[PDB]
Design a protein around this ligand. Structure first.
Ligand SMILES: Nc1nc2c(ncn2[C@@H]2O[C@H](COP(=O)(O)OP(=O)(O)O)[C@@H](O)[C@H]2O)c(=O)[nH]1
Ligand SMILES: Nc1nc2c(ncn2[C@@H]2O[C@H](COP(=O)(O)OP(=O)(O)O)[C@@H](O)[C@H]2O)c(=O)[nH]1
Ligand SMILES: [Mg+2]
Ligand SMILES: [Mg+2]
Ligand SMILES: [Mg+2]
Ligand SMILES: [Mg+2]
Lengths: 186, 187
């Protein structure tokens, strides 16, 4: 079972930006070993005015092959996964509150999956925001029965390489390795 | 709420080609409602400094928001999906045999999932290949206890517009609109 990394949070919080920067090496660019995307998910809006006025939107899943289909078995979607819960630090401690429904949803979907909390927009946040978010996390999110285990929490500018991002990148790799190894333990 | 269309088959069969032609649609609104991809799935190859067994690949799922994560609940993945099963007609009747493990796998995901069978590469298919495939489908795939309900089967050139491609587009729309119904007759 290839380890899944699930990047969740609210729209605009910097998830795609954060992943871009995490994967940014350009020693080999982004050299994936398949010529085609394994799973392509896109919406297909269909206007059917000849039919009973029902503008139908299909959520289309294009699978490369059997390996990619197999990887979406409910067993694999719900078990072997590290979660990144991403929020915009520049919007303050309200965004930490908004991580709570995410953490309930992660615990429900994937009961064994650990979470790394990532505050983006550090560069456009102030110490008052940094401090209030830090306090709220340690008091209200860390080591709570009913939430995923929170392995670590980071504050990053997701648009650039930095010590804090390298540490996050290290944590995701190390946390992925260690997660795979423990679940083999009896 | 929102039906999933699952396009499945072996690599090189023409799945991505077929979808891009289907989605050219009626040369009207090209507009995709979101500025960003709802679900982006990428492989992240990582070279690790730690020695011994090394070089780990992460399968990364980048979710736009709460609606996209919710949409991947196993309930919707398994109980709200229509399947396009795609094979390369130009490789002959052996590709119809290779659809059988696919149909077993689909049945296991959800007993009630309908499948539309599509043979691509009609344009570079011999007439005898097409006849052997039609015969094999009708004898061995259609109306089988243990396979999904095969609603219809199609032979198309997936690279261009045709009457056959338009009929496939109509079948997908009708099967989407009538998803619950024909299951309800037996169940
Ligand atoms: N200044 C700053 N902008 C960021 C940061 N992270 C994300 N952004 C910006 O936030 C906006 C939304 O980012 P995106 O990756 O699309 O968010 P997503 O919807 O969570 O995938 C974009 O304009 C990004 O450039 C950050 O750390 N600092
Ligand atoms: N001549 C012809 N080529 C096709 C047809 N459908 C797909 N192809 C070609 O088959 C190759 C693989 O197609 P692709 O859509 O990438 O297949 P996928 O791996 O199943 O997604 C490409 O070179 C396509 O142009 C068809 O109906 N006729
Ligand atoms: Mg995004
Ligand atoms: Mg899942
Ligand atoms: Mg493809
Ligand atoms: Mg499914």
């Amino acid at each position: 079972n290839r380890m899944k990394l699930m990047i969740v949070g609210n729209t605009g919080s910097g998830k795609t930006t954060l992943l871009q920067q995490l994967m940014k090496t350009k020693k080999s660019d982004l050299g994936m070993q398949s010529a085609t995307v394994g799973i392509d998910v896109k919406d297909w809006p269909i206007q059917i005015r000849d039919k009973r006025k029902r503008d139908l939107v299909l959520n289309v899943w294009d699978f490369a092959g059997r390996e990619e289909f197999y990887s979406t078995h409910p067993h694999f979607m719900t078990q072997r996964a590290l979660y990144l819960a991403v929020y915009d630090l520049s919007k303050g401690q309200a965004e930490v509150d908004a991580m709570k429904p995410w953490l309930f949803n992660i615990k429900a979907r994937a009961s064994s999956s650990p979470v790394i909390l990532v505050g983006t927009h550090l560069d456009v946040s102030d110490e008052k925001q940094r401090k209030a978010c830090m306090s709220k996390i340690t008091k209200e999110l860390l080591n709570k029965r009913g939430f995923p285990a929170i392995r670590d929490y980071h504050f990053v500018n997701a648009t650039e390489e930095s010590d804090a991002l390298a540490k996050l990148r290290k944590t995701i790799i190390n946390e992925s390795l260690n997660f795979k190894i423990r679940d083999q333990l009896v």
